[PDB]
Amino acid sequence: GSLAPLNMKGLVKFQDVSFAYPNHPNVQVLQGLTFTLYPGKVTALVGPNGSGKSTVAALLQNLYQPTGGKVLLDGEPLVQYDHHYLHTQVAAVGQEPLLFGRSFRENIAYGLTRTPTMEEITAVAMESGAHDFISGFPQGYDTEVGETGNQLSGGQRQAVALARALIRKPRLLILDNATSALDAGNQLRVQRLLYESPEWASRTVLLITQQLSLAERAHHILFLKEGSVCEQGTHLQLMERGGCYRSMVEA
Amino acid sequence: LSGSLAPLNMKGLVKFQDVSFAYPNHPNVQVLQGLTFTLYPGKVTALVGPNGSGKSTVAALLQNLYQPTGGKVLLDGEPLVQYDHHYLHTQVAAVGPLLFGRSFRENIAYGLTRTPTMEEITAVAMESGAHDFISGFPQGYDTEVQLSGGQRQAVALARALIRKPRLLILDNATSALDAGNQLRVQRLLYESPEWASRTVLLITQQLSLAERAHHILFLKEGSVCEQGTHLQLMERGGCYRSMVEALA
Ligand SMILES: Nc1ncnc2c1ncn2[C@@H]1O[C@H](COP(=O)(O)OP(=O)(O)OP(=O)(O)O)[C@@H](O)[C@H]1O
Ligand SMILES: Nc1ncnc2c1ncn2[C@@H]1O[C@H](COP(=O)(O)OP(=O)(O)OP(=O)(O)O)[C@@H](O)[C@H]1O
Ligand SMILES: [Mg+2]
Ligand SMILES: [Mg+2]
Numbered sequence: 001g002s003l004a005p006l007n008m009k010g011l012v013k014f015q016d017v018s019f020a021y022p023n024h025p026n027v028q029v030l031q032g033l034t035f036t037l038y039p040g041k042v043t044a045l046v047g048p049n050g051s052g053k054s055t056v057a058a059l060l061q062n063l064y065q066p067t068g069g070k071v072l073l074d075g076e077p078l079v080q081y082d083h084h085y086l087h088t089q090v091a092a093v094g095q096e097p098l099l100f101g102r103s104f105r106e107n108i109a110y111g112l113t114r115t116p117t118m119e120e121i122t123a124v125a126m127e128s129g130a131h132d133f134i135s136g137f138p139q140g141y142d143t144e145v146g147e148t149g150n151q152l153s154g155g156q157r158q159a160v161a162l163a164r165a166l167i168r169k170p171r172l173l174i175l176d177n178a179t180s181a182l183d184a185g186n187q188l189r190v191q192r193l194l195y196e197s198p199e200w201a202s203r204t205v206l207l208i209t210q211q212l213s214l215a216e217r218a219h220h221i222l223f224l225k226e227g228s229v230c231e232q233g234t235h236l237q238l239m240e241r242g243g244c245y246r247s248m249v250e251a
Numbered sequence: 252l253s254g255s256l257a258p259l260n261m262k263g264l265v266k267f268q269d270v271s272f273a274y275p276n277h278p279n280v281q282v283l284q285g286l287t288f289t290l291y292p293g294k295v296t297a298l299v300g301p302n303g304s305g306k307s308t309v310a311a312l313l314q315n316l317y318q319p320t321g322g323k324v325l326l327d328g329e330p331l332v333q334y335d336h337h338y339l340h341t342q343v344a345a346v347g348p349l350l351f352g353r354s355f356r357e358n359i360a361y362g363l364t365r366t367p368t369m370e371e372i373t374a375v376a377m378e379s380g381a382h383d384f385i386s387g388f389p390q391g392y393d394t395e396v397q398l399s400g401g402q403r404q405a406v407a408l409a410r411a412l413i414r415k416p417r418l419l420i421l422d423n424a425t426s427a428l429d430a431g432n433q434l435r436v437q438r439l440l441y442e443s444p445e446w447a448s449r450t451v452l453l454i455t456q457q458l459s460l461a462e463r464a465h466h467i468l469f470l471k472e473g474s475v476c477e478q479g480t481h482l483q484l485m486e487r488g489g490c491y492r493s494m495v496e497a498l499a
Contacts, residue, residue: 048429049385049401095400095427113400133303138279151277154423155302155456177400180426183302184497208430210401211457213498251430 002078008203010171012037014061015208019055019227020152029055030227034038036182037172042194042205046245049109053208054120057174057226060093060206065108073096073172088113089169093178097161099149104134105141107149108163116167129186130159154181160189169199176208180207191217212249255275257338262327263417263450265290265313270471271321272308283310283473286322290418295451297461299468299491303363306454307347309470310422313452314345326418339366344416346407346424348395355385356392359409367413375413378439380432400427408436417447422454437463457491458495 004011019030030052037043045053058064059071062078073187078086099107108121108130121141127132128168133156137143149157158181166175179190192227195217207215216235222236223245225231230244238245270286273279278339282305290296299466311317312324331339333424341364349358350462359372359381367419372392376382384402386440404427409421425433440446440453441463453464462481467482469476469491477489484491 024388049380049405049427049432055401104366151274153303153307159302177427181302181423181456182492183300184458186302187456188497210427210433213459214431248430251434 003076003080003083004082005074005084007170008035009074010039010089011046011072012172012204012206013058013072013075014056014059014069016069017066017071018054019059019064019066022064024117030059030066030226032228033224035222035229035232037182037206037242038220039202039204040200040202041219042200042207042217043220043222044207044209044218045222045224046209046212046215046248047230052227053224054176055227057092057176057206057208059170060174061090062086082185087111088168089171090174091165091168091172092174092176093161093165095177096163097149097157097178099145099152099157099160099164101143101145103139103145104130104160107145107160107224108141108167110164112167119169121163123157124163127166127188127189127197128157128159128163129182130163133159146172155183155186158182159186168192170203172204172206173200173216174206174208178210179214180209187214252337253332256329256333257335258327259493261342261417263290263292263342264327264417265450265452266325266328267309267312267322268325269322270303270312270319270324272312272317272319272448275317275374276442276482280366281473283312283319285474288468288469288475290450290452291466292417292450293447294339294465295453295463296466296468297453297455297464298470299455299494300459300460300468300476304470305473306470309387309453310420310452312343313418313420314343341414342363342416343415343418344411345420345422346411347422349398349403349406352395354393355381355388355406358396358406359392359413361410363414371413375409376405378412378435379405379409380428380435381409401429401432404428405432406424412439416449418450418452420447420452420454423456425460426455426457433460458498469494 013036014033017033020027065079098238100110101107105121111115134141209215221238222232265287266289270283273281319321331406350361385392423424425436440451468478
């Protein structure tokens with residue numbers, strides 16, 4: 001399909017979604033999967049290894065389509081949205097991002113549908129915690145970054161990739177173990193970005209992590225087990241119930 | 252003298268003595284500077300500190316992937332360069348991707364200087380938390396290597412553990428593991444008799460993991476700012492406490 005609307009809220013709904021990878025049809029990854037990601041909220045997606053969290057992230061980028069049920073963005077099936085329109089409103093960051101371009105400046109601007117100013121580049125780098133280390137180099141943002149950012153440190157890489165996601169001003173930001181290498185100061189910066197920024201209380205965030213301390217301030221938590229939401233709610237609500245989430249935090 | 256040592260006995264006592272380092276192709280950036288510490292066998296030593304402080308660089312030097320530009324990296328009192336490269340590979344294992352066209356058993360067995368049994372491979376896979384998902388496949392361990400982030404880390408960990416190295420280096424190696432698997436690995440390192448005599452360097456930004464460590468090294472701008480146990484460092488009121496306070 002062909003949708004590319006001017007205005008977007010960012011309301012995401014999975015409705016009884018099922019999925020198996022195309023070249024492994026008999027292996028159910030997601031099943032009976034239902035949840036809502038509300039606009040301007042941080043929703044955490046947590047659960048055991050192999051439960052399907054990264055697969056959910058992939059469907060949210062329309063990398064694959066559900067085998068059953070519906071994946072909706074503002075009440076419209078995702079598959080109907082323009083490939084490029086989606087690219088502009090949906091941004092995913094993983095644990096080990098590939099950083100294209102020859103310098104920090106090019107790394108951050110890469111993939112953006114326009115030419116940003118250095119002011120804009122600097123702003124998002126300050127938000128992501130990348131600015132300080134970048135500014136420490138003689139050439140600053142024009143310092144050469146080699147072979148897709150593999151000469152940066154683990155956390156420097158994540159900080160740069162996050163800046164690059166932020167400058168797109170996406171309606172849906174997906175963080176998949178994306179801050180696991182950040183130091184405490186930068187992790188704090190990202191907590192402030194997620195929960196104390198005026199821009200991200202209007203945009204919607206899917207936060208996938210094994211570090212449940214990061215998810216405590218989430219507005220909603222989804223606990224995924226064997227491809228479906230076992231339980232969901234706030235940290236305190238889930239802690240009161242005494243189920244999967246409780247057992248994971250206490251462990 | 253390079254590559255002449257391969258002793259029958261390795262205590263695994265590691266000493267950095269006044270180590271300096273800049274990467275050969277970026278010589279203007281001093282990464283480590285006057286870096287001194289000791290990793291004792293029978294301890295998990297956590298190496299923590301800000302992004303870019305040089306922690307993964309310390310891991311690379313400990314594998315003899317680069318040489319210090321100043322000072323000494325000693326293993327049982329001898330400079331690392333003096334060990335035979337194959338020998339050092341039997342004694343030192345680092346975990347930080349899997350090999351494309353090989354089976355899971357071949358992936359776990361990879362880098363081992365002998366041929367292990369399926370019982371050997373299964374055992375270590377249960378310890379790392381890779382067993383259940385591998386067993387789920389119809390052909391099991393014979394399946395050719397797609398995996399989740401945590402499953403990949405579990406497989407990479409089993410590969411290192413099966414080498415039974417004297418020095419194990421974990422560089423953010425469990426960041427994708429779930430609570431269950433993270434707990435099992437911790438139990439293995441802190442409770443198993445085999446790891447009780449070995450030396451473990453645990454590099455992590457998850458300060459909770461650093462909390463059980465027998466010793467903690469706080470690295471800042473390529474040098475140790477302070478060190479001790481969690482409870483000692485919390486009392487001192489320095490960089491470590493500031494870091495723990497920021498997260499809390
Ligand atoms: N490209 C792929 N092709 C086939 N199977 C896949 C593919 N990617 C993932 N899988 C499988 O789908 C299941 C779900 O994987 P997924 O990566 O979504 O889990 P996860 O919850 O993100 O796990 P983790 O917490 O370890 O990251 C796993 O069993 C995995 O082996
Ligand atoms: N291969 C390389 N060539 C040149 N410089 C490098 C290389 N690898 C890392 N560096 C640089 O050396 C410095 C130390 O990086 P290192 O990865 O050792 O830090 P770290 O303490 O491991 O950081 P993090 O906590 O983010 O993982 C960084 O500023 C980094 O950009
Ligand atoms: Mg995943
Ligand atoms: Mg590192």
